[PDB]
Amino acid sequence: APITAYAQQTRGLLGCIITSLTGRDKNQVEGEVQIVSTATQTFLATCINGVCWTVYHGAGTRTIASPKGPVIQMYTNVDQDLVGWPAPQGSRSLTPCTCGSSDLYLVTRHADVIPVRRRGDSRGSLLSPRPISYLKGSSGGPLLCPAGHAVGLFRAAVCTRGVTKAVDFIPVENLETTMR
Amino acid sequence: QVEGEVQIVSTATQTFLATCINGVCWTVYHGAGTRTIASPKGPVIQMYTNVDQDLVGWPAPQGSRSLTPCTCGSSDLYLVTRHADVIPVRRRGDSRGSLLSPRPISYLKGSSGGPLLCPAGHAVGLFRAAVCTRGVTKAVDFIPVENLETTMR
């Protein structure tokens, strides 16, 4: 029905660092979008089709911490700026959109849903523009169509005087492509 | 800590809903009247009384959070009832929308004041009243969120 989201924090700075190094994450996993961090940075990773995806410009070739030690990427496509690990035990996966709608909804790291109008294959504009600091940490977040299906992954922002009006995204089809 | 955007409210006789939008807890004049809302510091007076639009608002209470006004102009709405059921409503005009799937009158009883959400879960309006044909509700009247926005100036 309507898209609504909530955030829960599962680790603090100290625990994250230890975990980054041990590469062992024992915590249970839930939800469709994971909030992820490195040493320098935080972003989002979306689970689509059993795979947890995010942007390359954040994850690099990095492994993901898991209950069984580090886990290696399953897909790495530098040109697409896409990376994927097998989706954690207990996450849930988004369905790729097939309605071709132009009314998009970006899900931010603060668990807000913001309207976005499609204007191309890989670009959309914010109906209510926002401060760039608000979108900070949201790269990798999903863009849903009105049925809550994944249309794409937020990749980059077009900002002007610190205010963001459009967002570039990796479209789901590029995921499927990357999957072959 | 978990905050609610929708409050289930009562007067001595009736029981209905209130929705928090922009820091104001809004509901229907036909349920609240000019009443004050309770608080642990004693009664709190309405910030807004708009008899014309069937609208009333107090400051958002504690344990509450605000909904964002819809800005996507969509027509696929969702009504939330006091039982937390969600029912799709297709928007007809400014203040009216029709159920996609009609329900007995009582299924909506006590839900006025509740929100009508767009696909983003942003607030499109407050459910104002059930439009009935012999015990069956097939549509709804609502206060458009813009009325609330303008009432604020």
Binding site: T4, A5, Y6, Q8, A111 | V2, E3, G4, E5, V6, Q7, I8, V9, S10, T11, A12, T15, A18, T27, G31, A32, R35, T36, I37, A38, P43, W58, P61, G63, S64, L67, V80, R82, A84, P115, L117, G121
Partner: peptide, 16 residues
């Protein structure tokens, strides 16, 4: 009499 708040609804389903 006052309007009293009898319960709350979280639209996101967020648990305790």
């Amino acid at each position: 009499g006052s309007v009293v708040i009898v319960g709350r609804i979280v639209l996101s389903g967020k648990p305790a």
